[PDB]
Structure formats: C-alpha cells, structure tokens
C-alpha cells in the first residue's frame, strides 16, 4: 500500500503542475517558461524576461500564440483563464 497522497498532488493530479514553451518570432530563437496556470500573462513575460538577462523590454514585447496567432497582454487572463495547458506552445514577439 502507500498511505494515500491521492488527496494531495502526491497522487491526486498528475505532476500537479506543468511547463510552457515560448518561441521568438521575427528572431527565430526560442525560450520556455517553467510555470503553472498561476503565472500572470504580464508575469509570463516577466518570468521569462526574468529568466533571460540581456535586459529585454517587459510590456513593450508580446507573446504571439500559435493557437490564434494573437497576443497576450493583460494578466487578468492567466494561461489557465484561457484554458491553456502544457500543450500550449507560446511565442515571443515585439
């Protein structure tokens, strides 16, 4: 047996979290975010700009979404808010 855990992410959900992949269009390079349905979109870029270090603009830049080739600006719509999972491939764009 094994206690349970099935109640907490110790067996309840899969890994209890996931990652994200970003793509820099117009530049053709790529970077990925390590986050969950909790990172603010306005945080997805920071969590990303924060990951990098060559001093990249924060809000000025934008993430192009291959799903609808649109852009993610407001944080009010977290990835999860949109219903995004780890099967969501993001992009980066000016």
CATH number (domain holding residue 57):
3.10.20.90
Nearest residue to 58 via CA among 46, 70, 47: 46
Number of domains in the chain: 1
Which domain covers residue 84, as residue numbers?
1-94
* Experimental method reported for this structure: NMR
């Amino acid at each position: 047996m094994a206690l349970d855990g099935i109640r907490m992410p110790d067996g309840c959900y899969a890994d209890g979290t996931w990652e994200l992949s970003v793509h820099v269009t117009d530049v053709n390079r790529d970077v990925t975010l390590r986050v969950t349905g909790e990172v603010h979109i306005g945080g997805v870029m920071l969590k990303l700009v924060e990951k990098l270090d060559v001093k990249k603009d924060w809000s000025d830049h934008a993430l192009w979404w291959e799903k609808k080739r649109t852009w993610l600006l407001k944080t009010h719509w977290t990835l999860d808010k949109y219903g995004i999972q780890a099967d969501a491939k993001l992009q980066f764009t000016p």
